[PDB]
Amino acid sequence: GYITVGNENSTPIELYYEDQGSGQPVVLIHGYPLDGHSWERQTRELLAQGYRVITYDRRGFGGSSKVNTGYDYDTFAADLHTVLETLDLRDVVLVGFSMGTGELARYVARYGHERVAKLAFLASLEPFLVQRDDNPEGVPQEVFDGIEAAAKGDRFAWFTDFYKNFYNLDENLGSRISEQAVTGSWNVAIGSAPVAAYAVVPAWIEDFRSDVEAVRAAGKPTLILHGTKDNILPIDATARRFHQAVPEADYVEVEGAPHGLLWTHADEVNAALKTFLAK
Amino acid sequence: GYITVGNENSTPIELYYEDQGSGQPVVLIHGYPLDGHSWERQTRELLAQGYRVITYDRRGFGGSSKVNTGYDYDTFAADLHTVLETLDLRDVVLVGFSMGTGELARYVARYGHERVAKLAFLASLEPFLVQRDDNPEGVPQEVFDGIEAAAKGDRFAWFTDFYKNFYNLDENLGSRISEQAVTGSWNVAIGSAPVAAYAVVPAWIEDFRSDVEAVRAAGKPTLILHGTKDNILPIDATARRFHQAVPEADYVEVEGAPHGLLWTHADEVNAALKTFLAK
Amino acid sequence: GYITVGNENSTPIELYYEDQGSGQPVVLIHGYPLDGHSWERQTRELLAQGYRVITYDRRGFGGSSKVNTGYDYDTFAADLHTVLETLDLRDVVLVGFSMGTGELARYVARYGHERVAKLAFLASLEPFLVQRDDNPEGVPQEVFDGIEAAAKGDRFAWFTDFYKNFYNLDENLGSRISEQAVTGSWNVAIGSAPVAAYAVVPAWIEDFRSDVEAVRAAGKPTLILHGTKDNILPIDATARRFHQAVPEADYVEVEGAPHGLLWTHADEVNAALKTFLAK
């Protein structure tokens, strides 16, 4: 399916989406640089549990418009807003992974939470990833400058390097992810808009601290889940701070899990989501 | 092109299709887990012979909607019905390969054959693939349970394993199919809906014996063709039984050919189709 | 985005396109067998310079309709005409690479140049590639017969062989193009219509000499640029003849560059385009 969310010059900006099953709606918002099918090990379990599972592809990724403009969380949240309004979803469970955790918080901040039943943040960006004078816990800017330069420099070679760290392949290749599944991740990645490989870097490092205040003040059931061996989003720079800021959230650390834990630790992710959604 | 065949929640179910050439219409219905381009070695010959060649992609595959629902032959036949009605095709030659042989028989059973000139069944599922008390010639259920578990377990690794047996690669790699063509088959496969990798297993093993009665009673020119080294659909469990049940059909065994014979034995397939369509 | 340019039987022929930025419009027309994203190293620079950058995918390629008909430059030029009329582009800079250089010349010949500000021909087909009694400078027909047979014979293996010569991989693999970028080129190539792999061969070798007269007589700023180690379009059979025929054009030979110089020599291409567009 497609939902129109805007225009880029003479072209409509269309987000590809899938809408499956019946029951309470659950919207899964994928990470960089994948698409809605990256949720497959979660989707099939949620469908079996009697939820209506919707995924969509972020602008620039998967089946969505390969735009040049709007790679920022105000825009990504406006896109999500349009998806929820177009489908008129109520009592929705929002689930974000990696980049998708940004949509959840920015959406609540900008649009409120009348439509939202629950929020699940998996491998979160929050609260503020890049080190600044007022954010000493963050990661030095130079890391992101280097990533931006690599992704712009040759996105094809970059995605290979990125997935090594995404999945902790030295540890997990052949035990928790096959060579073929890694190749599938790469094939999806290179289909994204060339500019999207690096245009998202500034979005990743936006300050979400005020959005985290909105999320906490909403008082809706919230889950924060992270792998302890996440080498993309270091657990001390993200989830542990997010947990400190939102102590009411259910909190899960998946021992030994990498960033790419929807696949490598699908069982643990599924168990946490099953418990959380049953509340 | 796209033809709408239904809805899955808020999304239309759209089948991708191609409609080329001029002359008597011939509809080619591809096998798992490929798409309409898998017919390329046949398509170009039929076009050169002065036929109008139409292919479409089965739901879940190729360019068609990546649905969760309807992976069964009643639905696959209803999809075909909608394609034929939408395009208002008359005197059509239907040609199925592997899964596509199921559409042909179920379509005739459910909708009749007023629009149909001829039927060609290549690498057929018929008559009933899975062993049961009333179907002693079939293959034990455990084979299909294992396939379903592998395809659900990791579809990326599964497609690699599947294509080895699909093409008899130990025999044919480098002589009747290139490494690059195998890779092309895999790239197409992983684009299918994640759920479609395994959701089709129960469809493959449906009982087609009553549909075979409908096909035989139609009395339209019929071709049944199979490779003698088909390790996906064993010739004694399928084509030889189908031939016994429909003795009026033209019958071709392609000596030494695997399941993937549209590619590896394109010449033999083309020669059989040319003769058959000329009648 | 899509622009409808015709019909093939029951299906509209739709060209995929992207329309980005603001400023004077620049239309980039890709080479075989790639798509509009192959321009990525040029697109991002032109956008940064304040141009509106449009690319589209040639019929049969990339995201465009996978047709069987119209693989000839009269049709390719009519497609371009429809793109320019549909978007109502004025003062447009047309930039062609490899096959795209054919659209530029045939378009001016058939439709004039009222909408066109400037023309840039990169790795040009012009003036007439195949040797004939009245074209002694051309390449013997047998070369093209061999290519057509290889591309029809197994397009998957063919694209691998083609890209070796496209990029001069013996020289450039690992220094000016990564293995991963080569794989990205192959993944895009195999997505093209099966018939398009070889149907374009006769189009490549059309006589453009009368079109070159139209281009020269237009008197619009023109750039001709070619790599000196182009092993796909030999510089003496193409650019040097084109330069002799249109001496008013700006002329650039990129020392040591292969056919695939948008990627391998992006800096040199970008520098030439920046200078040319600034005029």
Coordinates of C-alpha atoms in Angstrom, one line a residue, chain B:
Chain B
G1 CA 0.9 -3.1 -15.0
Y2 CA -1.3 -3.9 -12.0
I3 CA -4.7 -5.7 -11.6
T4 CA -6.6 -5.3 -8.4
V5 CA -7.9 -8.7 -7.1
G6 CA -9.0 -7.9 -3.6
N7 CA -8.1 -6.1 -0.3
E8 CA -6.0 -6.8 2.7
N9 CA -7.3 -4.5 5.4
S10 CA -6.8 -0.9 4.1
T11 CA -4.7 -1.9 1.1
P12 CA -5.7 -3.1 -2.3
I13 CA -4.2 -6.5 -3.4
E14 CA -2.6 -5.7 -6.7
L15 CA -1.0 -8.2 -9.0
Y16 CA 1.9 -7.0 -11.2
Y17 CA 1.6 -8.1 -14.8
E18 CA 3.1 -7.7 -18.3
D19 CA 1.1 -7.8 -21.5
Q20 CA 3.2 -8.0 -24.7
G21 CA 2.9 -8.7 -28.4
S22 CA -0.1 -9.4 -30.5
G23 CA -2.0 -12.5 -31.4
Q24 CA -3.7 -15.3 -29.5
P25 CA -3.2 -14.6 -25.7
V26 CA -1.0 -16.9 -23.7
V27 CA -0.8 -16.5 -20.0
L28 CA 2.3 -17.8 -18.2
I29 CA 2.0 -18.5 -14.5
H30 CA 5.3 -18.8 -12.7
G31 CA 6.6 -21.0 -10.0
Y32 CA 7.8 -20.5 -6.4
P33 CA 9.6 -18.3 -5.5
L34 CA 10.3 -16.5 -8.8
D35 CA 8.2 -14.0 -10.9
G36 CA 7.0 -13.5 -14.4
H37 CA 10.5 -12.8 -15.7
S38 CA 11.5 -16.4 -14.9
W39 CA 9.7 -17.2 -18.2
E40 CA 12.1 -15.1 -20.2
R41 CA 13.5 -17.9 -22.4
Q42 CA 9.9 -19.0 -23.2
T43 CA 8.4 -15.5 -23.5
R44 CA 10.7 -14.3 -26.2
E45 CA 10.0 -17.4 -28.4
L46 CA 6.3 -17.2 -28.0
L47 CA 6.4 -13.5 -28.9
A48 CA 8.5 -14.3 -32.0
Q49 CA 5.8 -17.0 -33.0
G50 CA 3.1 -14.3 -33.0
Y51 CA 1.4 -14.8 -29.6
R52 CA 0.4 -12.1 -27.2
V53 CA 2.2 -13.1 -24.0
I54 CA 0.9 -12.1 -20.6
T55 CA 2.6 -12.9 -17.3
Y56 CA 1.6 -11.9 -13.8
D57 CA 3.2 -12.3 -10.4
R58 CA 1.4 -14.5 -7.8
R59 CA 0.3 -12.6 -4.7
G60 CA 3.3 -12.3 -2.3
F61 CA 5.9 -12.7 -5.1
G62 CA 7.7 -10.4 -7.5
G63 CA 6.0 -7.1 -8.0
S64 CA 2.7 -8.1 -6.4
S65 CA 1.2 -7.1 -3.1
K66 CA 3.2 -8.6 -0.2
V67 CA 0.1 -10.0 1.6
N68 CA -0.3 -12.1 4.7
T69 CA -3.6 -13.7 3.7
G70 CA -4.8 -16.0 0.9
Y71 CA -1.9 -18.4 0.2
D72 CA -4.3 -21.1 -0.9
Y73 CA -5.4 -22.3 -4.3
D74 CA -9.0 -21.2 -4.0
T75 CA -7.6 -17.7 -3.7
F76 CA -4.8 -18.1 -6.3
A77 CA -7.5 -19.3 -8.7
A78 CA -9.8 -16.4 -7.9
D79 CA -6.8 -14.1 -8.6
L80 CA -6.4 -15.7 -12.0
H81 CA -10.1 -15.4 -12.6
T82 CA -9.9 -11.7 -12.0
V83 CA -6.9 -11.3 -14.3
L84 CA -8.7 -13.1 -17.1
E85 CA -12.0 -11.2 -16.6
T86 CA -10.3 -7.8 -16.2
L87 CA -8.3 -8.3 -19.5
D88 CA -11.3 -10.0 -21.1
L89 CA -9.1 -12.6 -22.6
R90 CA -10.7 -15.1 -25.0
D91 CA -9.3 -18.3 -26.5
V92 CA -6.5 -18.1 -24.0
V93 CA -3.6 -20.6 -23.7
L94 CA -2.9 -21.1 -20.0
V95 CA 0.6 -22.3 -19.1
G96 CA 1.6 -23.1 -15.5
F97 CA 5.0 -24.0 -14.1
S98 CA 5.3 -25.7 -10.7
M99 CA 3.0 -23.6 -8.4
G100 CA 1.3 -22.3 -11.6
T101 CA 0.0 -25.8 -12.4
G102 CA -2.2 -25.4 -9.4
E103 CA -3.9 -22.2 -10.7
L104 CA -4.7 -24.0 -14.0
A105 CA -6.5 -26.9 -12.5
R106 CA -8.3 -25.0 -9.7
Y107 CA -9.4 -22.3 -12.1
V108 CA -11.0 -24.8 -14.4
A109 CA -12.7 -26.5 -11.5
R110 CA -14.1 -23.3 -9.9
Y111 CA -14.8 -21.2 -13.0
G112 CA -15.0 -23.5 -16.0
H113 CA -13.1 -23.0 -19.3
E114 CA -15.2 -20.8 -21.6
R115 CA -12.2 -18.4 -22.0
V116 CA -9.6 -21.2 -22.4
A117 CA -8.2 -22.6 -25.7
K118 CA -5.5 -24.9 -24.3
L119 CA -3.8 -25.9 -21.0
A120 CA -0.1 -26.6 -20.5
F121 CA 1.1 -28.1 -17.2
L122 CA 4.9 -27.9 -16.8
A123 CA 6.5 -29.5 -13.7
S124 CA 3.0 -30.2 -12.2
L125 CA 1.9 -30.5 -8.6
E126 CA -1.0 -32.7 -9.6
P127 CA -2.7 -34.8 -8.6
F128 CA -2.0 -34.7 -4.8
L129 CA 1.5 -34.4 -3.5
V130 CA 1.3 -35.4 0.2
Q131 CA 0.9 -39.0 1.4
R132 CA -2.3 -39.8 3.1
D133 CA -4.3 -43.0 3.9
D134 CA -6.3 -42.3 0.7
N135 CA -3.2 -41.1 -1.2
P136 CA -0.5 -43.7 -0.8
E137 CA 1.5 -42.5 -3.8
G138 CA 2.3 -39.1 -2.2
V139 CA 5.4 -37.8 -0.4
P140 CA 5.4 -38.1 3.5
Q141 CA 4.1 -35.0 5.4
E142 CA 7.4 -34.7 7.3
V143 CA 9.1 -33.5 4.1
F144 CA 6.7 -30.5 3.9
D145 CA 6.9 -29.9 7.7
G146 CA 10.7 -29.7 7.3
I147 CA 10.5 -27.3 4.4
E148 CA 8.0 -25.1 6.2
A149 CA 10.3 -25.0 9.2
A150 CA 13.3 -24.2 7.1
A151 CA 11.6 -21.4 5.1
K152 CA 10.2 -19.9 8.3
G153 CA 13.5 -20.4 10.1
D154 CA 15.6 -18.3 7.8
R155 CA 14.2 -17.7 4.4
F156 CA 17.5 -16.2 3.1
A157 CA 19.5 -19.4 3.8
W158 CA 16.5 -21.5 2.8
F159 CA 16.3 -20.0 -0.7
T160 CA 20.0 -20.9 -1.3
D161 CA 19.4 -24.5 -0.2
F162 CA 16.2 -24.7 -2.2
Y163 CA 17.8 -23.5 -5.5
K164 CA 20.5 -26.2 -5.2
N165 CA 17.8 -28.8 -5.5
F166 CA 15.6 -26.7 -7.8
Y167 CA 18.3 -26.6 -10.5
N168 CA 20.3 -29.8 -9.6
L169 CA 23.3 -27.6 -9.2
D170 CA 25.8 -30.4 -8.5
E171 CA 25.1 -31.5 -12.1
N172 CA 24.1 -28.3 -13.8
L173 CA 26.0 -25.3 -12.3
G174 CA 28.4 -24.1 -15.0
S175 CA 26.9 -26.2 -17.8
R176 CA 23.2 -25.5 -17.9
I177 CA 23.0 -22.6 -15.4
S178 CA 25.5 -19.9 -14.5
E179 CA 26.4 -18.9 -11.0
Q180 CA 25.0 -15.4 -11.9
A181 CA 21.7 -16.8 -13.1
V182 CA 21.4 -18.6 -9.7
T183 CA 22.1 -15.4 -7.9
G184 CA 19.4 -13.7 -10.0
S185 CA 16.9 -16.4 -8.8
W186 CA 17.9 -15.7 -5.2
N187 CA 17.6 -11.9 -5.5
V188 CA 14.1 -12.3 -6.9
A189 CA 13.2 -14.9 -4.2
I190 CA 14.2 -12.6 -1.2
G191 CA 11.9 -9.8 -2.5
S192 CA 8.9 -12.0 -1.9
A193 CA 6.8 -11.3 1.3
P194 CA 8.6 -12.9 4.2
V195 CA 5.5 -14.9 5.1
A196 CA 5.1 -16.2 1.5
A197 CA 8.4 -18.2 1.9
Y198 CA 6.5 -20.8 4.0
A199 CA 2.7 -19.8 3.8
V200 CA 2.6 -21.5 0.4
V201 CA 3.6 -25.0 1.7
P202 CA 0.0 -26.1 2.6
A203 CA -1.1 -24.8 -0.8
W204 CA 1.4 -27.0 -2.6
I205 CA 0.0 -30.1 -1.0
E206 CA -3.7 -29.4 -1.6
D207 CA -5.7 -32.3 -3.1
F208 CA -6.1 -31.5 -6.8
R209 CA -7.7 -34.9 -7.8
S210 CA -11.2 -33.4 -8.2
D211 CA -9.7 -30.5 -10.1
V212 CA -8.0 -33.0 -12.4
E213 CA -11.4 -34.4 -13.2
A214 CA -12.6 -31.0 -14.2
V215 CA -9.6 -30.5 -16.4
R216 CA -10.0 -33.9 -18.1
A217 CA -13.8 -33.4 -18.6
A218 CA -13.1 -30.0 -20.3
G219 CA -11.8 -31.8 -23.3
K220 CA -9.5 -28.9 -24.3
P221 CA -6.0 -29.6 -25.7
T222 CA -3.7 -30.3 -22.8
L223 CA 0.0 -30.8 -22.4
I224 CA 1.8 -32.3 -19.4
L225 CA 5.6 -32.0 -19.3
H226 CA 8.1 -32.9 -16.6
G227 CA 11.8 -33.4 -16.1
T228 CA 13.0 -36.9 -15.3
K229 CA 15.5 -35.7 -12.7
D230 CA 13.0 -33.3 -10.9
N231 CA 14.1 -33.5 -7.2
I232 CA 11.4 -31.0 -6.1
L233 CA 8.4 -32.7 -7.6
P234 CA 9.3 -36.4 -8.1
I235 CA 8.0 -37.5 -11.5
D236 CA 6.4 -40.7 -10.1
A237 CA 4.5 -38.7 -7.5
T238 CA 3.2 -36.1 -10.0
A239 CA 3.5 -36.1 -13.8
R240 CA 3.2 -39.9 -14.3
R241 CA 0.1 -40.0 -12.1
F242 CA -1.3 -36.9 -13.8
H243 CA -0.7 -38.6 -17.2
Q244 CA -2.5 -41.8 -16.0
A245 CA -5.4 -39.7 -14.9
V246 CA -5.6 -37.6 -18.1
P247 CA -4.5 -40.0 -20.9
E248 CA -5.8 -37.7 -23.6
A249 CA -3.1 -35.1 -22.7
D250 CA 0.0 -34.7 -24.8
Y251 CA 2.8 -36.0 -22.5
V252 CA 6.5 -35.1 -22.5
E253 CA 9.3 -36.4 -20.2
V254 CA 12.4 -34.2 -20.6
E255 CA 15.3 -36.6 -20.1
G256 CA 17.7 -35.5 -17.4
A257 CA 16.0 -32.3 -16.6
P258 CA 15.6 -30.8 -13.1
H259 CA 12.7 -28.9 -11.6
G260 CA 14.1 -25.7 -12.9
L261 CA 13.9 -26.7 -16.5
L262 CA 12.4 -23.5 -18.0
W263 CA 16.0 -22.3 -17.8
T264 CA 18.2 -25.4 -17.9
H265 CA 16.3 -27.1 -20.7
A266 CA 14.7 -24.1 -22.3
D267 CA 15.2 -25.6 -25.8
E268 CA 13.2 -28.8 -25.0
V269 CA 10.5 -26.8 -23.2
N270 CA 10.2 -24.3 -26.1
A271 CA 10.1 -27.2 -28.7
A272 CA 7.2 -28.8 -26.8
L273 CA 5.3 -25.5 -26.4
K274 CA 5.8 -24.6 -30.1
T275 CA 4.4 -27.9 -31.2
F276 CA 1.5 -27.8 -28.7
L277 CA 0.4 -24.2 -29.4
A278 CA 0.6 -24.8 -33.2
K279 CA -2.2 -27.4 -32.9

